Structure 1
Amino acid sequence: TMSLGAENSVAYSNNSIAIPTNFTISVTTEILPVSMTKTSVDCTMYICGDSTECSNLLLQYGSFCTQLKRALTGIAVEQDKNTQEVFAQVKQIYKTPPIKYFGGFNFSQILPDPSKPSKRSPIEDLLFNKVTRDLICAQKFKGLTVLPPLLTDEMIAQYTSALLAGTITSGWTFGAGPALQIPFPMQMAYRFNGIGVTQNVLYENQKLIANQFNSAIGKIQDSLSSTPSALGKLQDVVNHNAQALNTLVKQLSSKFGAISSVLNDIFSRLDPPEAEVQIDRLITGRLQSLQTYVTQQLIRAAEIRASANLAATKMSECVLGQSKRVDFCGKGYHLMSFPQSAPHGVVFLHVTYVPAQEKNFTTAPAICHDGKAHFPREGVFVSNGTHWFVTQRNFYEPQIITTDNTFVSGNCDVVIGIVNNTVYDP
């Protein structure tokens, strides 16, 4: 029987609080398909195989040779708009400065590399290597072809390099309006400030947060490789298209009530009035097989568009700004996101603030002094056993209770659980 996880028992008291004393910056990955493989079929090659009389009987049918092509054309344009609404959320192509010293962080695996003649980051090197008469030529000789995408891998690479040269040198000011320069040490101090933590934790632990970040990016290079199936949702969309195109070429050799499946043999053994009877069994059947493919491709494009629109939201709310949506931009208090190109998809590297090393304290709603209650302005009232201090909520920082972080509203007879102390005044 599958277990649902360990059985932890969080203690709950009236005067107990757990405030963390350290942090662990973790960089996770997120794979999302943003595109597909544009296909194009031919009516006079799939239905009629090198036949001239069959082309005459095919025109006698309805309009099932132009609404299928127009439907596949709409998919092709749709697969060219998904890559134009996600990787093109910026008009200008920002560039990284020559000197690379961002306070102590090592942006060497997500930034493009000039040595290799492909302009791809070290992280975007194993993504294009794992996601990969031959079959590509056999399907072409049956009327099933593949159209090349509009934006090549080179243009998508420099598109992910403009969203990565503004997130580090401008922060979130390059997606709203004009790109405003800002030092990265002062960028991680305003992102640490939107998760409850103050900015006096980064400037006092910059070298520690820089080592945790560098140690978290170096593991993504190994995690994606070591994992048996990491880029699997980018291969499922490829295998599904490599299966519908193979299940469609295998229906050209299955007779549906005729003497054979070769159209060149029905006209060489049967005169022309029994043929017309047995050719409509190898045309109407093949028309429904080609129609079933287009029908499933429309449902397939509806699943890719949902993931594409989701990728556009996670590249404008995780990359173009810090989000306050839990589980959306990673797993934890969201700080940053770096878009990484991938075959028919994108890889999000979410930086999440994860508290650690929590210690129990003694909490109190309000304190009493001079016959009036004092509530914490921004923080929590904790106690180390003998003295009462006011600390933050996402990080432990003992500070004396002064008259600069408490507001007096009420008396000491309405709040249940109010301790007595001495509110210092400067």
Structure 2
Amino acid sequence: DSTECSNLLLQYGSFCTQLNRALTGIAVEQDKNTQEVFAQVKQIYKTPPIKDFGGFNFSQILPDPSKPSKRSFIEDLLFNKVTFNGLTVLPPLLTDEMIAQYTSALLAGTITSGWTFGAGAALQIPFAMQMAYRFNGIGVTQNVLYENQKLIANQFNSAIGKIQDSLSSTASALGKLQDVVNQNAQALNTLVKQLSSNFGAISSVLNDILSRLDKVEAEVQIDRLITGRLQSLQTYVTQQLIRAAEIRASANLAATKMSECVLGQSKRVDFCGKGYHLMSFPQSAPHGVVFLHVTYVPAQEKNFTTAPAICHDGKAHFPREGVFVSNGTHWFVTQRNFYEPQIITTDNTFVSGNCDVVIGIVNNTVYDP
């Protein structure tokens, strides 16, 4: 606000205006990102009091109704782990309490209602049946889930417990979000620090220059400081444009992960983290989002002899839904991604031509029901 500089700044025309348009562009992108990730749902679903979820203990990832602002327990860990000339630090369009409602609603739909709450009106479904469908998604016959439902729930709750300990015991999992705040605090501190720099001028104290000098000399010295301070701002805003384009690339990825990895069961290998995908839950965090991906990973295995077909009445038979396997003494058909042996039958197979074409075919009895 020192008047001699305020006069001389009018020499440069549009620069000291258009930086506010540039930074307004940055500002709108933040609420655009935040909206396009979290607002992917038309109604604020909320969960009934019951917990008949087949033993899946979601109490850690659901909102605690007693919590000062309605975070989940795990959202609260994440909130705790992440940590003046001309400056303004604007509000986000949405408050942390609003974000907690969106991360509640999406999760409430994802718990209660399959994928349907993304694709249309939310339709309630029993949670075991939702996991049974998601198992069918990765190619496992739905009975295999129900026949292990307690063991799977016990594995899942154990895994959720291990998530709490992983997040609590080290901050190093949250490095990305802390890095983003650190980059901004660094940039702003250097932008402020450049006010002390001299740029070939007599001083970096503005009113000092005005006290020492001839008006004409002071105009030269002040034009140096204006030139330095201007180039500093153009440098900083150049960084914030590039950085906002980067964070928006992350935002369009996040927006995709919501639509594909929460609202559905997007099959894309190694999109929903490691392993064949089952479902994923969003949790809010400062400036960001945290996905709990839930994924099936096979873990004990056996060798079998295999033949790409079997021969019976001189007709070749192929497995209808799986692969043929043996331990040398007999032959069984099994589903591709989990050991589940069955008797070879006309309906567990299909016919295609005479045997003589097929390399590695084996002779065996098809039982015909």
Give yes or no for contact 2:275–2:295 (8 Å, CA) kept in 1. yes
- Residue 201 of structure 1 is aligned with which of 133, 144, 148? 144
Show structure 2 runs of 5+ residues with no match.
none
How far apart in 2 are the matches of 1:321 and 1:188? Answer: 12
- Which residue of the partner structure matches residue 131 of structure 1? 82
Distance 1:289 1:228 in 2: 33
Which of 103, 107, 119 in structure 1 is aligned with 2:54?
103
Of 271-280 and 155-164, more deviation after overlay is shown by 271-280
Match of 2:282 among 309, 324, 339: 339
Match of 1:231 among 165, 174, 181: 174
1:228, CA displacement in angstroms? 4.4
Partner of 1:321: 264
Distance apart, 1:397 and its partner CA: 0.8
d(CA) in 2 for partners of 1:345, 1:249: 26
TM-superposed deviation, 1:230:
1.3
Asked if the contact 2:191/2:233 (under 8 Å) is kept, the reply is yes
For 2:100 and 2:114, how far apart are their aligned partners in 1? 20
Shift of 1:115: 1.7
Give yes or no for contact 2:81–2:171 (8 Å, CA) kept in 1: no
The Cα of 1:413 is off from its aligned counterpart by: 0.6
Residue 403 of structure 1 and its aligned partner are, at CA, apart by 1.0
Offset at residue 157 of structure 1 (A): 0.6
Following superposition, the deviation at residue 143 of structure 1 comes to 1.1
Deviation at 1:181, TM superposition (A): 1.1
Q: CA deviation at 1:210?
A: 0.6
Q: Distance in 2 between matches of 1:52 and 1:275?
A: 13
Deviations 1:333-376 (A, max 9, x none): 10010000000000000011001110001110000001110001
How big is the shift at 1:226? 1.4
The structural deviation recorded for 1:60 is: 2.2
SS of structure 2 residue aligned to 1:339: strand
Structure 2 contact 309–319 (Cα < 8 Å) conserved:
yes
The structural deviation recorded for 1:180 is 1.0
Does the aligned pair in 1 maintain the 2:333–2:344 contact within 8 Å?
Answer: yes
Q: Render the CA deviation track for 1:272-319: whole Å, top value 9, x for unaligned.
A: 111111111000111010111001100000110000000000011010
Cα distance in 2, alignment partners of residues 222 and 161 from structure 1: 22
Cα distance between partner residues in 1 of 2:202 and 2:309: 91
CA drift at 1:144 = 1.5
- 1:49-76 deviations in Å (ceiling 9; x for gaps): x411110111122211110011001100
Aligned residue in 2 for 1:83: 34
Aligned partner of residue 408 in structure 1, secondary structure = strand
Q: Distance in 1 between matches of 2:312 and 2:344?
A: 11
Aligned to 1:47: none
| Runs of 4+ displaced beyond 6 Å | none
Q: Give the CA RMSD over aligned residues.
A: 0.8
Partner-residue secondary structure (3-state), 2:355? coil
Moved more, 297-306 or 249-258: 249-258
Determine if contact 2:136/2:142 at 8 Å carries over to the other structure.
yes
Moved more, 87-96 or 264-273: 264-273
Q: Assess if the C-alpha contact under 8 Å between 2:195 and 2:204 holds in 1.
A: yes
- Where does residue 127 of structure 2 map in the other structure? 184
User: 1:227 deviation in Å?
Assistant: 2.4
Structure 1 position 421, deviation (Å): 0.1
Instruction: After superposition, give the CA deviation of every residue in 1:103-149 in whole Å (9 maximum; x if it has no partner).
Output: 221111110001222111111111001101xxxxxxxx311221111
CA distance in 1, matches of 2:322, 2:77: 45
Q: Is the Cα contact below 8 Å between 2:19 and 2:237 reproduced in 1?
A: yes
SS at match of 1:70: helix
Secondary structure at 1:142's aligned position in 2?
coil
Q: What's the secondary structure of 1:360's corresponding residue?
A: coil
Post-superposition shift, 1:384?
2.0
Distance in 2, matches of 1:218 and 1:67, equals 51
Counterpart-to-counterpart distance in 1, 2:124 and 2:220? 75
2:68 and 2:184 mapped to 1: Cα distance? 30
Residues of 1 paired with 2:229 and 2:133: CA distance? 62
Give CA deviations for 1:170-205 in whole Å, capped at 9, x if unaligned.
Answer: 010010111111111110110000111110101111
- Matching residue of 2:19: 68
Sequence identity (%): 97
Shift in Å, 1:94: 0.4
Matches within 5 A, 1:3-18: none
- The separation in 2 between residues aligned to 1:88 and 1:344, in whole angstroms, is 15
Partner-residue secondary structure (3-state), 1:347: strand
SS of residue in 1 equivalent to 2:156: helix
Distance, in Å, in 2 between the alignment partners of 1:368 and 1:108 is 54
Higher RCO structure (Cα 8 Å, ≥6 apart)? 1
Structure 1: give runs of 5+ residues left out of the alignment. 1-49, 133-140
1:385 Cα shift? 2.1
> 2:69 touches 2:97 (CA, 8 Å); kept in 1?
yes
Question: What is the SS of the residue equivalent to 2:46?
Answer: coil
Match of 2:250 in 1: 307
SS of the residue corresponding to residue 268 of structure 1 reads: helix
- 8 Å Cα contact 2:323-2:333 kept in structure 1: yes
